[PDB]
């Protein structure tokens, strides 16, 4: 049954294992013969599945690593809060949020870097931050710095607690294998306890603390005159003056006449005119409903009592038209190996992050967030990159599982075998789809370029010559615009202002949100996005499916997961492992994310963001040139890359100069990556031979004989440098432009 | 068909014969070593060129050498 | 919001910007304290 | 004086550049209150700029037509401090480092497994070896004369 | 104590200590003498 099972003092804490490096692997622990040993010592550090074979030790190591990661995260949060408390202009920004730029870092005065202390505003000099922490603090109700200091101290305490917990659970009382293999209890506790209770407590905080303070702030009261948050709890008269429903107490809740709470639990939707964000009452209502839903859903699986559901029974008793017996042995596979769970969770987290970025840019949930353009751009790009990286890692872990943890004798599944028995058709169809999509999507642009270069503007695919309009998206937009009139009588207005139809919202002379039009350019860019996504999916799926064996190599599983090749024979067998497939798909993920962020940036600058005069006219940043210049590659190169790079290259001698320096440095790194992607090991080894001879002549020969990097190491270095350089270039360009112009 | 050659520095450890994926090499009795055997490559036409035999050979330089040569259906690893 | 706190803010509108400016100046000078002259090598012990 | 260059105290573009820098600093200085710390920091910056320009004028460098100082690496006795003396200092430091490293390598070469000594340095031996680099030129010259510098 | 001292003598720890000391000394030297383009002592 469900029980607590632990082992007492499995390991003894001592420094004897710190002295000798590479104690986990005997081959590494033997000693360094050449330099390659060092490069191995860091590669196999976290491969717990290769150190031993028992599941118990692997699970304990995973638990301790999770605790350490939590401690590091808590330390980072405490540091951020302390910086916000001490070196910041939060109190000055609180009174005048529109005319003051947030800043939470101060640079020293050693070399001459004091030029980096720009005039952000409010009698302060420092670096303007784009993390969006000030909006979070304002929405939480913080109006002083003592609270931030207390939060930092609490974060430090919690980080220390997490570190101690990790040490205790590895070296003092380590749970047994049966403890980890209880998925029903874990699911119940994660659904009902971790998610429902936390959201319920946050809803309670919002009801009791955030709403009154934010109402006082929105009224126009000075932040230094607002009553302290505990005064609202202590004094019921203040809350009665603010919200009369509280005068009735908690009696309505048990009386089921919940309408009395309609004052601070509303369903209006839309954006708040004063701050350009969502209503806080709607947020509290949503959190309460989510808490109820999670608390109800957390009691589904049978643990220690008669009532409940069994996951294995649900999987086995599943019957359907296309499935059949299907999911019979999936429970053992999922409860036996960590890699399948890691892949599933990685893919889900990446998809959730992308959805989070979309929902966050579409409907701003924080006050004074829509009118701060740099924060929005940074959040969108950062979340998109994180989601892409996680989605990439999921496939690599799936391939690792398929390579080293799959055996069809002891643990056999029908669906996996059926999929593995017809992989050729899947690969062929995906290849054809990718070819067709790429041909059409890029041929449209090439045709537009050629027709425009020949003095034939009437033959292009544009809104004036040959129109390809997204009719389905326009229909969906119209339906969403007309939704609250008849389909959703509860809501006063639509969920978002993006849908075509409604009014414009602007805060403090700057546009917050307005409906986004859709035309031929959106059609073309959407098809390009689909093409890139399909190619990445094709690469990753081909890597995953052909991991065990192939027509060219019938015994690829014996060589392992990380091997360079099989030999010069068969015409050439370079890059046949799944690791090479992941290393190749990284490039396409980078390409797709870069295209997506470029599209988002240009469209938002051209059609949404801008300024409003007193008369009522709206002037956008780039004056709406997206619909006519983004249909050709020359337009993308000239009106986006050339025009918007004026700020970054002219930032020398100002407070933004650092960005400009990065705009150069990243470039260098990118070029450096090419050295590791175009060459091979033999040339470098032969050069190191002569260098070693020259060293030997002067009696400076080291015992550890120098060796050139392995092929896999070179590929990893090249791809890492490429990605870092590209991402840093985009980061510097985006930040410089959006800070200098917005 | 590629060309596989064996030199007299071989010590008869039988690693190359075990490493071959297409059954090209075998062992024959010999006279000039402690192991009293030496490798040979009769089935040369079945060689693909993977060079696993060279990968598994303890010597200052390999006693088994593979030189790529005229390609055919068998040496190209084609199943269609 | 009851217009009494608004009247309090209007009455005490002055010296509030002064307090904000003083806090911002202290936050900035927390990095230049040594270059200013105060908080020199003596009295750094349990100071600043 | 040399290659059509003007002494940096005589040149007018130097003073013009100083004026532009001072004006640029004062433009930002005018914003903040006189008692505020940013005003003190900007005043310190202005004083530092003035001192730097005065020192550059004093040291006798030669600005060009554009008004920026130029360096002479000919070996002319009037400009030995620009290149030659820092070069000698750098050569001394680099020789010290190289001699110390080579001495440590030779010292640890005796043991059975020097690799474990390379990956895990021993501190007492290195501390003893380090201070012998203060006299590296003499030791190197004597070893070259004897014939112990070059392996055979 | 022996094992802790042995660990403290490993390459990355010694490297980071040496480089931190060197960086601190260089920063302090540049602070005491703000700007330097030629060697003026002679
Ligand atoms: C990749 C996509 C692509 C596409 C779709 C087009 C499309 C077009 N181009 Mg452009 N072009 C492209 C790329 C592309 N171009 C490139 C890369 C270049 C080189 C730079 C050019 C250069 C170019 C020039 C120089 C010219 C054009 C022009 C044109 C038009 C001429 C069409 C025509 O006469 O032949 C169409 C011929 C066919 C035989 C159609 C075949 C497709 C059929 C419909 C298959 C559909 C399959 C079906 C579903 C099968 C199902 C089977 C089932 C029933 C069982 C057309 C709108 C011409 C123009 O003036 O137009 C205004 C022109 O002079 N193009
Ligand atoms: C998330 C990680 C994190 C990061 C990246 C930073 C980053 C920074 N800190 Mg912060 N800090 C953090 C967490 C963090 N801190 C925490 C948890 C605390 C509470 C103890 C502090 C308390 C703190 C203080 C008290 C100070 C800084 C300062 C600094 C800056 C200079 C550090 C220095 O030069 O040390 C030198 C390196 C070594 C001693 C070695 C640097 C921007 C300094 C500052 O900005 O001054 C202007 C400074 O005075 N930090
Ligand atoms: C209702 C109680 C409960 C709660 C709150 C949690 C919460 C959590 N568990 Mg789960 N878990 C539970 C029951 C619970 N568990 C049970 C009964 C089992 C056994 C089947 C597991 C098995 C389990 C494993 C194997 C792992 C987790 C992990 C995690 C953490 C996920 C990290 C994260 O998402 O950041 C959310 C971050 C925060 C909310 C941090 C707040 C700190 C919390 C509140 C600590 C108190 C929690 C603890 C259950 C209560 C203390 C008991 C002890 C004092 C006697 C999170 C702290 C993962 C982890 O990260 O490991 C450390 C992990 O590897 N859980
Ligand atoms: C999630 C945690 C949470 C917590 C800890 C509290 C805590 C509290 N509530 Mg709040 N409340 C919450 C969520 C929460 N609330 C939600 C979701 C709603 C919306 C229905 C409300 C609406 C509400 C009302 C209408 C009232 C309170 C009241 C109270 C206070 C009285 C104490 C008491 O009766 O026991 C609470 C329970 C425990 C501590 C256990 C107390 C501060 C009363 C009050 O106003 O006092 C100041 C009251 O009349 N609360
Ligand atoms: C969610 C967390 C997560 C976890 C726990 C794991 C866990 C694991 N991974 Mg997976 N992986 C993930 C996500 C994750 N992965 C993602 C998102 C990707 C896509 C990139 C991958 C792709 C991947 C590959 C390609 C491989 C693994 C492998 C492994 C194993 C070895 C780990 C290792 O030795 O690294 C220890 C740490 C390092 C070697 C550090 C390398 C330095 C990094 C790359 C630099 C990043 C630099 C920084 C961001 C920039 C600042 C520069 C500054 C420092 C100057 C380990 C079981 C390896 C394996 O052998 O599996 C059997 C393997 O080959 N993973
Ligand atoms: C910008 C240069 C570039 C280009 C154009 C391509 C092109 C392509 N890549 Mg490659 N690739 C590149 C760089 C490039 N790659 C780099 C840097 C890497 C990293 C190593 C890769 C790695 C890579 C991988 C891992 C994969 C590909 C695949 C593909 C194909 C995708 C399918 C498709 O879209 O075809 C449609 C055609 C095009 C988009 C090419 C341009 C054609 C235009 C429209 C002209 C047509 C005009 C006309 C017919 C010309 C006639 C004139 C003549 C008579 C004189 C396609 C051939 C994928 C694949 O092959 O699967 C199908 C795949 O899996 N590539
Ligand atoms: C096609 C998809 C569709 C979707 C996704 C929704 C979605 C929704 N409906 Mg609408 N609705 C639809 C079609 C749809 N409706 C149709 C065809 C009708 C005519 C019968 C209505 C009439 C309707 C009513 C009468 C109500 C909703 C309400 C709701 C909302 C709360 C859902 C809930 O009850 O739990 C939610 C936004 C509720 C609401 O507006 O509360 C906010 C509600 O009272 N809907
Ligand atoms: C690495 C060697 C190093 C050395 C030799 C010095 C040397 C010196 N320090 Mg510096 N210092 C260093 C690192 C170093 N510091 C580090 C890492 C920090 C960050 C904590 C400081 C922070 C610091 C302060 C805060 C002060 C000095 C001061 C001084 C001077 C004291 C006499 C002298 C120039 C003191 C001085 O004389 O200032 C007027 C002074 O007050 N130093
Ligand atoms: C921010 C932050 C922080 C803090 C935090 C906090 C401060 C928290 C809190 C929290 C809390 C404060 C929570 C609470 C919770 C609560 C709960 C969860 C409750 C519940 C309840 C219930 C469940 C009830 C029930 C019932 C009913 C239904 C009816 C009648 C009867 C009874 C009453 C039983 C820290 C520093 C750490 C870190 C960093 C960040
Ligand atoms: C996304 C993300 C993030 C964030 C996060 C967060 C924000 C979280 C939160 C979380 C939370 C917010 C949580 C919460 C929790 C809670 C809990 C866990 C509770 C509990 C409770 C209890 C246990 C109670 C009890 C009791 C009492 C006291 C009274 C009555 C009776 C009873 C028994 C019921 C970051 C940034 C980091 C980054 C990464 C990612
Ligand atoms: C440049 C290059 C090399 C040569 C790269 C080498 C040798 C890496 C050198 C790394 C560092 C710089 C060596 C020294 C590391 C020590 C930590 C130095 C200690 C001394 C002080 C700096 C502290 C390859 O070996 C290679 C192999 C396969 C494909 C491509 C390539 C490739 O492109």
Curated annotation (Swiss-Prot), chain B:
Residues 1-30, 38-67 form the 4Fe-4S ferredoxin-type domain. Pfam families: Fer4_21. It is a peripheral membrane protein. One of its GO terms (biological process) is photosynthesis. [4Fe-4S] cluster 1 binds at residues 10, 13, 16, 57. NCBIfam families: PS_I_psaC. Apoprotein for the two 4Fe-4S centers FA and FB of photosystem I (PSI); essential for photochemical activity. FB is the terminal electron acceptor of PSI, donating electrons to ferredoxin. The C-terminus interacts with PsaA/B/D and helps assemble the protein into the PSI complex. Required for binding of PsaD and PsaE to PSI. PSI is a plastocyanin-ferredoxin oxidoreductase, converting photonic excitation into a charge separation, which transfers an electron from the donor P700 chlorophyll pair to the spectroscopically characterized acceptors A0, A1, FX, FA and FB in turn. This is Photosystem I iron-sulfur center.
Curated annotation (Swiss-Prot), chain C:
It is found in: Plastid, Chloroplast thylakoid membrane. Belongs to the psaN family. Interacts with GRF5, GRF7, GRF9 and GRF10. The transit peptide is the site of PSAN that associates with 14-3-3. May function in mediating the binding of the antenna complexes to the PSI reaction center and core antenna. Plays an important role in docking plastocyanin to the PSI complex. Does not bind pigments. The N-terminal Edman sequence is 2 amino acids down-stream of the N-acetylated terminal peptide identified by mass spectrometry. This suggests an additional processing. This is Photosystem I reaction center subunit N, chloroplastic. The gene is PSAN.
Swiss-Prot record, chain D:
GO terms for molecular function: mRNA binding; protein domain specific binding. Keywords: Chloroplast, Membrane, Photosynthesis, Photosystem I, Plastid, Thylakoid, Transit peptide, Transmembrane, Transmembrane helix. The lineage of its organism: Eukaryota, Viridiplantae, Streptophyta, Embryophyta, Tracheophyta. It is found in: Plastid, Chloroplast thylakoid membrane. The chain crosses the membrane at residues 80-100. It is a single-pass membrane protein. GO terms for cellular component: chloroplast; chloroplast envelope; chloroplast thylakoid; chloroplast thylakoid membrane; nucleus; photosystem I reaction center; plastoglobule; thylakoid. Its main location: plastid. The keyword Calcium does not apply. Belongs to the PsaF family. GO terms for biological process: photosynthesis. The chain holds residues 68 to 219 of 221 of the full protein. Plants lacking PSAF have altered thylakoid structure and are not viable. Participates in efficiency of electron transfer from plastocyanin to P700 (or cytochrome c553 in algae and cyanobacteria). This plastocyanin-docking protein contributes to the specific association of plastocyanin to PSI. This is Photosystem I reaction center subunit III, chloroplastic.
